[PDB]
Amino acid sequence: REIITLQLGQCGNQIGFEFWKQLCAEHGISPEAIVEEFTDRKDVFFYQYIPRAVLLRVIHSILNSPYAKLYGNNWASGFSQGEKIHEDIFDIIDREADGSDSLEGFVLCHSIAGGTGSGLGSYLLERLNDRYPKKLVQTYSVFPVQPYNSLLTLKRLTQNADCLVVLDNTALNRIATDRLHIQSFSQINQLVSTIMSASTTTLRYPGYMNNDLIGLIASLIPTPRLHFLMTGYTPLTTVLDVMRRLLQPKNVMVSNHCYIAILNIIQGEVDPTQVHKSLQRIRERKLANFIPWGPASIQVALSRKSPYLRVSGLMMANHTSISSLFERTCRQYDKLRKREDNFDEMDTSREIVQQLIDEYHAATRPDYIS
Template sequence: LFREAEEALFDIFEREAESSDYLEGFQICHSISGGTGSGMGSHALEKISDRFPKKLVHTYSVFPAMQKEASDVIVQPYNSILTVARLIEHPNSVVVLDNAALHRISSENAPSKSTSSFDHINSMVSRIMCAATATLRFPGPMYTRLIHLITALVAFPPMRFIQTGLSPLREGEAAVLKTSVNDTLRRLLQSRSLMSSAGMEKGVDHCLLSGLALLQGEIDPKEIFAAIVKLKERQDVKLVLFFPFYIHLEAGC
């Protein structure tokens, strides 16, 4: 069964790669705790690295919750540890999506109690993916290729695990209060907006190597520079002393 699935999967990869006008890389969505996402996902990463050694690989990886009561899958820790080893070796960048954080944000922001948590979580993740690739699909002056995004976020190759956030957290046609670049950037760094359980508030042991904020809307460039200055003045994040800090901001409609 695995061999049949493998042949069908990589036949699709080969066919799509051949039909592409300009293939820059691959994006893979998977969970690292389940059998298929961890086992088949790891195998796919290895095969893509072998068959397309010069192409980029960018993954959206769902990590298991650290709480014991969050899952009844006994082999979840083993699957996760073995998959993380492949994520360190093969992809160029990994967006970390923490299962516990996703469920927490879903419960706090779901439009109604009748809304399925999985539907809401999938909606959030799809919005993150759409926002992250907006500069590729609607080219502007910067970040028009996948390599540009990876270069801005991955300070040096071993540190390829990316923490992501989304603000405002709204669904459908829900109204959003008018905000500013400074306020949006401040809320992006709050734990309630992050898709992982590791917060960046003061007092939490963390450090930021680099960052990229993709903003949508009609924005004055002066607001962007002022927001960066205020971010550093407030010391919202802890910076490493041995490495130059960069936070890139890109605005688009």
């Protein structure tokens, strides 16, 4: 099962580039797309090496980079341009689709901060559900007239994208000043590319459990509505050190409340005899709170680092606190609704997200059923 990526706007093409650098570094792949001398299945992302990239100004500098051999501002205008090149761009997708053995998903790297890609992102997801109804789509959207373009794409992402990994630049810059002391764009993305790289540690390296993209998502997302995730990455030393440093709100990449499911990926060679002990100490101290209705647990799996390149770890969670972020956005909309052909699509968009904000607040009650 092969995976293919799409990068839109200025943001998606930037972080996706460094995502291609860091991933190409994990394997023994020279910048010139040639294997050097110097186990790891490199066929899911690379096709004989050629990466399955689809890039939609900065592209000129991208080819000017040493990795050349590796291949308006409104929302409606971003949606219009996507319609003007409907068939022209789509041929690239189809020829890459069936030319591949068995497509599994569609990784989408894009921003919703008022860019032409933000609309461009809204269009592709509509058609991706039109043509291929049996193909999962994952999107690593990133959060910041900015209220407008933000709340609109949320209307499409809640019914087309079967998964989503949110990344807000606000909580990122807090990490930038504190533990890197920058006071730039190419500076914060250094850590962002790290999150995505380790996010697919269980895919590029074979393991027992979770050997496919449906193996990770099916456990966390309980319903096609509550389909929002957050990430964590602690190394910036035993197992009880990792999981305890992950649950802190100082590390989460997000600006009652409880968890639904957690996933912790350990990449080190740590002694696996103590992984159950760390699970006991986290329970007894009661450092995290779960749902009361159904039995919700925390899962951990192991894998191995790139031998070419120390204990790392990733935390993936579905927290109902993500509802607060939306409330920050939609509140700005009502304020911009009273201050400034039909303006009816903006109505149903505001309408459908307010159903989602109702769906989260209802999950925290012991009687969420019915």
